[PDB]
């Protein structure tokens, strides 16, 4: 029932920085983790990165090594993704997303099974 909304999206030159960012449309209660997948041409979706929305704990891919920041804005229902060093490998439509978790055992997001998706947005990078 989150409704996600992504913008940021577009071109960008290898090496060079984007931040994408992410509103649920009403409130995101403490229970979720808010999280950024990807989908690359002609390749599966992958996770990106999450965050527990009231924890604030994170986790990343391998694929990030570091580049990337996922963060959070909990007065604004807003989740960011920060992506530093950009790639070709990058070029690919970031999917927010939100999976709620009331019965979690600890404050460590998931990296999959999420259930609420936004539309995407494209983020093409430049050789």
């Known amino acids: 029932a989150v409704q996600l909304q992504e913008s940021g999206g577009g071109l960008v030159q290898a090496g060079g920085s984007l931040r994408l960012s992410c509103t649920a449309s009403?409130?995101?209660?403490?229970?979720?983790?808010m999280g950024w997948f990807r989908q690359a041409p002609g390749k599966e979706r992958e996770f990106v990165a999450a965050?527990?929305?009231?924890?604030?704990?994170?986790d990343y891919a391998d694929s990030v090594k570091g580049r990337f920041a996922i963060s959070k804005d909990n007065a604004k229902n807003a989740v960011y993704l920060q992506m530093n060093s950009l790639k070709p490998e990058d070029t690919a439509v970031y999917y927010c997303?939100?999976?709620?978790?009331?019965?979690?055992?600890?404050?460590?997001?998931?990296?999959?099974?999420?259930?609420?998706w936004g539309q995407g947005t494209q983020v093409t990078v430049s050789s």
């Open positions: 997303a939100a999976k709620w978790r009331p019965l979690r055992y600890s404050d460590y997001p998931s990296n999959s099974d999420y259930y609420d």
């Open positions: 965050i527990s929305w009231s924890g604030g704990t994170t």
């Open positions: 009403g409130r995101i209660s403490s229970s979720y983790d």
